[PDB]
Symmetry: D2
Subunit: 256 residues, 4 copies
């Protein structure tokens, strides 16, 4: 068990990628705060995962909620050792149709949410004096722009950048900051994602997803489970010398 | 010469780099909107440059000011062919001292200001149906993070991403979107920049600036004139096949 | 006349892109050594271009030919101010079919040829004490690997790398070293290239070429003329502060 | 545990980084071929490591030696599952002093050695039908050039490129190709590396090594043990969806 006795918090972990990370972390001996805007779903998730997972209501766009979430983790587990910034929102629209609402919402959650949660965790970790681990969720989208995905790509580029900056600033406190960049990951969101491409590219529903899946060198779209090995690795002692990096786990969909 | 008959608008061009760009564009035969929030200096600059330059009041953080600026180029110049997003703000603080005010202010101007001005320009260019040129100002800060400069770095990373996405979306309208990434450029702003570094790096005043200058492979910090050639090139016919690129003009300070 | 009074040498300029550069340089006032293994065609080209162009026999794989070529520009033009390393060979094969012959031949021309010509030009430029410009030809292939193009991609990656190293080492002598990276350029060679892809991807003849052209965001494969502006720019005073860069001119085919 | 029953071959594994990888692999349950040009050193390393390690004489510059080594692996273990291309040579010299001997020797070992060993391993893995893992050793040097290290940097850039190309071509055979890029790693070679820098930079002995060590954000130069976690990870099932990536493990010395 590579994370034995560790205290983690994962934002947006009631469902999806964050939820898989939560389960993997518990398997590896960690206690995990299931942080989510949906307290009901967080409580269900925590009960399904087991005794070591516990629900925390959190809105990463609000400072008071961020601070309350950190304090609940300290209260419940005695401190905080691992942060995963997984909360994210996707959207899509061509340049001439980008709205200020899309820009503000996606930046508030994907960039500000990650930045200020990272900062609150950093402060707690510094106060503890024991290190150690922060993992941001980037994306292939942050590696290169895309015609219909300007806002989301830009938030993920910002995340990769913040990962580098925070990494350099916090390593003196024995805190590693790194990021994982998935490529295309299958899941409940892809119906809406495909529908959005179908609308703007004028394709039959389902065609975009299929083309995307067929283009991954590996042979298929990713699963959350493809990513858990890396999430454990970057939270363990085996990654202590790894600083300010973004690692693509994407079946070859992007090369860095 | 190279920009004969072209209508341009440059944000933040009352002073510094933007003004040097405006003066260079006029020498190359363009008509130029000196768009700045400092309308008094924009007017003095427009008056000094000559009849081909005219002052436009603009605050890239306000949608109505953005739309009014584009309307102004239509009124004065009959339309818009070249947009340079030059307006920007700098700040510096370690992760644990980053404020929401700093985040919101730098993103509103550096990211939202660039995105929505680009969008307004693109709409006008598409309506004209004669293609166009858009040049965003990035920075070495956009290429890699820095311990003390998380916010500014992230905004410039977002600009590089947006440059990429917009370039891919808009090329079918014959609009080139690219960016210039300067390195370190000398100017009065370095008193404050040095002071901020001196404080957090525990150095005597002037030392940071000195060291930064000495470390540029070319052998000196940049001037506006180092950048003017590239600004003309990316607005000229010689750059027609150039799409979604960021070009470093930085004395070798960063290699891309 | 941005290259007035300058002396240049361009490798592999009897035909194609290199010849287009030579013609462009001549129009900008330069004297140009048409250097090529195909001396017959180089002579014909120099005669067609006009009195400022002269043929020079060179095989970039042979040190004695390189040194004699540099000596030729000194003799005919009085010195050497601009070098363009354009000579290159292409090949294609899946990993399990790559031969040592293909490896040796592509590295000798593409990498050794560029490196040691660069070296010989640099020595002459340092001896002159007037600085200089060196432009290497990279490729999109140099920016990212490709299943069937391992050898060529690796040579172009080596070129980008060498451009960076040489740029850092030579700038103290006022020599700018940079590179241009074209995307896909139409031409006679595409019949063979298409044929090779057709074989390994199991495609009808001409399909690969068609798909490639349609996949370029700009909407067409490149021409030599798309590249001439950048070639002049990087040899001119407008690029003095530009060091160790590789610039993509590729219709958006790769974003750097 | 993590590599139970796997057959590995690591080039240059008698001493240094390869040796550490060999020892870590054996602890994780692998059988390891200790390939080295120095057969007595290989036979000795194998003896010391244990019964799961066996010596193989190999010159990665010779096709026949490469082919013989793979065959011995198939002879001793029942086949080959993991290849680590660790054999490498370093050299240093400014542009004007680079010799053809330095160019040829470093490229033969660092590039050709890696390419043709990877090719022979791939062929054997394809014939087995059970997939496989291949890890190339890159370097921070492959990420960006340096004034005094053009040859070595260029070889490591070529390695990163080959990693991408081979990864894309071989994943259909269920062979993962990835690379590790250490930053600066302490070891017996650094006394000579420092000496080379001291010579050309004209420094007291030891000054370069200290400055380099002090500039790593983490706080010290690397050890081989910093890298073993990643070497195991990329050879294990936890990296199955990881293709064509180069991962920096370098204390923050370079960010990718
Ligand atoms: Na629970
Ligand atoms: Na005026
Ligand atoms: Na002639
Ligand atoms: Na043994």
């Amino acid at each position: 068990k590579r994370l034995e006795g560790k205290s983690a918090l994962i934002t947006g972990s009631a469902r999806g990628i964050g939820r898989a990370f939560a389960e993997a972390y518990v398997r590896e001996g960690a206690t995990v705060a299931i942080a989510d805007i949906d307290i009901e779903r967080a409580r269900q998730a925590a009960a399904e995962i087991g005794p070591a997972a516990y629900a925390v209501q959190m809105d990463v766009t609000r400072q008071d909620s961020i601070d309350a979430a950190i304090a609940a983790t300290v209260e419940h587990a005695g401190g905080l050792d691992i942060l995963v910034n997984n909360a994210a929102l996707f959207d899509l629209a061509p340049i001439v149709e980008i709205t200020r609402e899309s820009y503000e919402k996606l930046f508030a959650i994907n960039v500000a949410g990650t930045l200020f949660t990272l900062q609150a965790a950093a402060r707690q970790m510094i106060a503890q004096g024991r290190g150690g681990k922060i993992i941001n969720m980037a994306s292939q989208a942050g590696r290169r722009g895309e015609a219909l995905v300007a806002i989301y790509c830009a938030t993920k580029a910002a995340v990769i950048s913040l990962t580098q900056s925070a990494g350099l600033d916090l390593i003196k406190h024995r805190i590693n900051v790194n990021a994982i960049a998935p490529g295309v990951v299958d899941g409940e969101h892809w119906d809406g994602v495909d529908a959005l491409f179908a609308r703007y590219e004028n394709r039959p529903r389902g065609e975009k997803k299929r083309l995307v899946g067929e283009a991954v060198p590996f042979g298929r779209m990713g699963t959350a489970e493809d990513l858990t090995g890396m999430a454990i690795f970057l939270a363990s002692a085996e990654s202590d010398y790894i600083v300010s990096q973004t690692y693509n786990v994407d079946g070859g969909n992007w090369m860095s």
